[PDB]
Amino acid sequence: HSHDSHDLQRFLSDFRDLMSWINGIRGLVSSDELAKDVTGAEALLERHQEHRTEIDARAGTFQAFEQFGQQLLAHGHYASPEIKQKLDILDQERADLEKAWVQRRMMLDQCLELQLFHRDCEQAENWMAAREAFLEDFDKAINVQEEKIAALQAFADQLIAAGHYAKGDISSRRNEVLDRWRRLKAQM
């Protein structure tokens, strides 16, 4: 009958339906939205992972498509050239999607790191502003605040060495705190 033509039709329809789904996630993952929070940067990650689960839930569907193309190819379908070409395209589209998801995840990780660094600069800065106003328990609470300013310094140097997207502002905020600290350290 039109068996072989109908199979080609099915193959191509499945192909395009998969291609459109990839398009949607592709745009979804193209987002440039970053949080201005730590709770927000965390929710952004929670959502990116849900997208990870949605991408992986399609694994079986994609293999059924590969299997379908394998059968058409194995039986020498007259459109084998065109069929194989679609496989190459889908393989590439799937690969780029995985890489796009990974890239966005990296950005969301760096967003969280930057937001955790900022809240550290604030815990130590809101504290230095307090001591700058009125200016033996003093002692223990000085060793305490110095431990925090040391973590805030190693943490900032870790991100800068990891190639953070905010190298310029991470190093700037730190150099600003380390100097505003050694100034209050001298007057105390």
UniProtKB/Swiss-Prot annotation:
Where does the protein end up? Cytoplasm, Cytoskeleton; Cytoplasm, Cell cortex
Provide the effect of R131W. Answer: In DEVEP; uncertain significance
Enumerate the Spectrin repeat regions by residue range.
6-109, 113-188
Q: Tell me the residues on which N6-acetyllysine occurs.
A: K167
Modification sites for Phosphoserine: S5
On assembly, the entry states:
Like erythrocyte spectrin, the spectrin-like proteins are capable of forming dimers which can further associate to tetramers. Interacts (via C-terminal spectrin repeats) with TRPC4. Interacts with CALM and EMD. Interacts with isoform 1 of ACP1. Identified in a complex with ACTN4, CASK, IQGAP1, MAGI2, NPHS1 and SPTBN1. Interacts with SHANK3 (via ANK repeats). Interacts with CLN3; this interaction regulates the fodrin localization at the plasma membrane.
Disorder association: Developmental and epileptic encephalopathy 5: A disorder characterized by seizures associated with hypsarrhythmia, profound intellectual disability with lack of visual attention and speech development, as well as spastic quadriplegia. Developmental delay with or without epilepsy: An autosomal dominant neurodevelopmental disorder apparent from infancy or early childhood, and characterized by impaired intellectual development, speech delay, motor delay, and behavioral abnormalities. About half of patients develop various types of seizures. Some affected individuals have cerebellar atrophy and ataxia.
- Biological function: Fodrin, which seems to be involved in secretion, interacts with calmodulin in a calcium-dependent manner and is thus candidate for the calcium-dependent movement of the cytoskeleton at the membrane.
Q: Which family does it belong to?
A: Belongs to the spectrin family.
- Its recorded name reads Spectrin alpha chain, non-erythrocytic 1
In the UniProt record, what gene is named as encoding this protein?
Answer: SPTAN1
Task: Identify the segment of the full-length protein shown.
Answer: 1337 to 1540 of 2472
